[PDB]
Amino acid sequence: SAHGPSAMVFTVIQGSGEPTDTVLRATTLSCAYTAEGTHPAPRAACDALNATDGELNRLLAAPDPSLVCPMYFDPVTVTADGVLNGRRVAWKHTFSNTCVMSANLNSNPVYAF
Amino acid sequence: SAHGPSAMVFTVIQGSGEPTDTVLRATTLSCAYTAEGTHPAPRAACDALNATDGELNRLLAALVCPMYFDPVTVTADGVLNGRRVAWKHTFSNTCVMSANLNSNPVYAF
Amino acid sequence: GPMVTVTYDPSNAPSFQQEIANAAQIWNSSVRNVQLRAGGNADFSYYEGNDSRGSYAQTDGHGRGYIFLDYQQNQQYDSTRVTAHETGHVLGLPDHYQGPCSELMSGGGPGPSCTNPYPNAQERSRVNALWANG
Amino acid sequence: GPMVTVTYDPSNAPSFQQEIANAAQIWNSSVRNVQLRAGGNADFSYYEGNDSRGSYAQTDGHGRGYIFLDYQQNQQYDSTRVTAHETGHVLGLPDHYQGPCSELMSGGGPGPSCTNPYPNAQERSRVNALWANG
Ligand SMILES: [Zn+2]
Ligand SMILES: [Zn+2]
């Protein structure tokens, strides 16, 4: 329920999230009096980030219940690092494959980059 | 070495860099065809970041500082030349931090 | 009468004495369940200086914490809207960046041209709900 | 003639066929120790799409890797300067963001008004030097 300014880096990585793994996409986001960063939709992204109430696992609280995904393995990892509500944070989540990622995140504005 | 785009978050934290520690300052930086971010001097920042050649410890290049204990940390997280990185360094005090960094444009925020 | 009176310390923000008073006047005349009062052993405080991040608030959302007002930002954006907006966070309101100028909690979202310092109907209702039982 | 002929694949960038061709002509007429081949089983490739980061290059700096050209950025910045600039990274040149428009490797640093796609004599010579024995 704590409120503070945020300055974050979000990334999507091809694989388990190993050091040599390819960074498919990344973007920056800053929320204070203004919503800015390299994020294509900062206003929407900052609002979506604040909805988690500090728990970034809540970026996965609303999955696509109808999207039927294959049960194969082609791992994809999402990350979030920086300042979240005035406190330094580090979070990552690896999905079985890209479908599983699409379905779980369900077009959350934070990862809409 | 290897060249790629960079997207970083830099911070200065009161203390050792623990989860409950107060963030004194933070900024974002992005280097690709354009140097941008919330950094007050992105062009200078991006060139200073690329000078390290992947090793962020190269940001530390050493007047006389008093010996008082009041720790402070500098952190860097994100994408550096297309690879995900996480770095931090703890100084005994702010004077020692300024002495080691010696106005490196990366922490000029 | 208010269910709660929240004390604020404006002494550490001498350059924003007027906008801090303006914010308290705007909120006191907008909500009934909570009132703001200037004082010493304050629940929350106002600070000023320079931060590359601009103005912000570090709060629990229930009267405790602090508000930092940046010099450069308050020269580009309306100081009273900035101060009233940040005071809204200490009263428990979140940001709604996608909101219009009529929404005080949209902050800097609608841009620097936006000068409205007053909370809308929904905002006034939300703060009354939050301070209803103290 | 040149020491090395580097093959590029422009097939995954159909919207930038003209600017890819211009970049190769700019570099082939600017350096003598290295030359760029129209296509085949290429050393490096061109891609296009949408990236919040804009256009960039992921390369070892010695002819291998790839260049990504962003749609929105190439509408705001000169497409030929963007393409020639990034081709410079595959040729082993770094960025010099603080540099002027006369410096091709300053990229987007001097702003969108900058349209110069040609590397200055210092850039041209470093490239000739990096491919002399390499
Ligand atoms: Zn706010
Ligand atoms: Zn470049």
Q: Which two tokens mark B81?
A: 């030349």
Q: What is the dihedral of CA D111, D117, D122, D127, to 10 degrees?
A: 120
Ligand number nearest to the C-alpha of C77: 1
DSSP label of B84: E
Whole-angstrom CA distances from B61 to B53, B77, B97, B100, B102 are: 14, 20, 11, 6, 7
Position C112: which residue type?
P
Q: What part of B 9-38 touches A (C-beta under 8 Å)? A: 9, 11, 13, 17, 19-23, 26-30, 36-38
CB neighbours of residue B53 within 10 Å: 10
The half-sphere exposure of D131 on its side-chain side, counting CA atoms within 13 A, is 28
Whether residue D97 lies within 8 A of chain B, CB to CB, comes out as yes
Residue among A1, A3, A7 minimizing CB distance to C57: A3
CA D35 / ligand 2 centre spacing (Å): 20
Q: Which residues, at least 6 apart from C13, have a Cβ–Cβ distance to it below 8 Å?
A: C20, C46, C47, C48, C69
Candidates D48, D88, B78, C59; CA nearest to A38 is B78
**Chains C and B, touching by 3 or more CB pairs within 8 angstroms:** yes
Q: What is the 3-state secondary structure (H, E, C) of C56-71?
A: EEEECCCCCEEEEEEC
Q: Which residues of C are catalytic?
A: 86
* Test mutation, D47, D52, D56, D59, chain A, max A CBs within 10 A: D52
Residue among B2, B7, B47 minimizing CB distance to D97: B47
Here the contacts of B61-66 (C-beta below 8 Å, separation 24 or greater) are B61/B100, B61/B102, B61/B104, B62/B99, B62/B100, B62/B102, B65/B93, B65/B95, B65/B96, B65/B99, B66/B95
A109 lies in which domain range? 1-113
Position D122: which residue type?
Q
CA gap A5, A84 in Å, rounded = 7
The answer to whether the Cβ–Cβ distance between A50 and C94 falls below 8 Å is yes
- Contact list, B9 vs chain A (CB under 8 Å): 7-9, 28, 81-83
Hey, what domains does chain C have and what are their CATH numbers?
1-134 (3.40.390.10)
DSSP label of A68: P
Solved by what technique? Answer: X-ray
Q: Is B3 annotated as a binding residue?
A: yes
Q: Is C96 annotated as a binding residue?
A: no
CA gap C91, C2 in Å, rounded = 13
Q: Is D96 annotated as a binding residue?
A: no
What total of structural domains would you count in chain A?
Answer: 1
CA gap D82, B32 in Å, rounded = 11
Q: What is the 3-state secondary structure (H, E, C) of chain D?
A: CCCEEEEEECCCCHHHHHHHHHHHHHHHCCCCCEEEECCCCCCEEEEEECCCCCCEEEECCCCCEEEEEECCHHHHCCHHHHHHHHHHHHCCCCCCCCCCCCCHHHCCCCCCCCCCCCCCHHHHHHHHHHCCCC
Candidates B103, B18, B10, B17; CA nearest to B60 is B103
**E-assigned strands of A32-101?**
35-36, 76-84, 87-95
What strands, in cross-sheet order, belong to the sheet with A76-84? A35-36, A23-31, A6-14, A76-84, A87-95
Residue among A5, A28, A79 minimizing CB distance to B84: A79
CATH number of domain containing B65:
3.30.350.10
Exposed / middle / buried, residue C90 (Cβ in 10 Å: 0-12, 13-18, 19+): buried
- Contact list, A89 vs chain B (CB under 8 Å): 19
CA A50 / ligand 2 centre spacing (Å): 34
CA gap A53, C60 in Å, rounded = 12
Candidates A99, A2, A19, A10; CA nearest to A55 is A2
Q: Which two tokens mark A107?
A: 């077009």
CA gap C96, C108 in Å, rounded = 10
- Contact list, B38 vs chain A (CB under 8 Å): 7, 28, 30, 36-37
Q: Which residues, at least 6 apart from D28, have a Cβ–Cβ distance to it below 8 Å?
A: D35, D36
Exposed / middle / buried, residue C64 (Cβ in 10 Å: 0-12, 13-18, 19+): middle
Q: What is the dihedral of CA B17, C60, A111, B105, to 10 degrees?
A: -40
CA gap C77, C104 in Å, rounded = 13
Q: Which residues of D are catalytic?
A: 86
Position D9: which residue type?
D
Resolution in A: 2.7
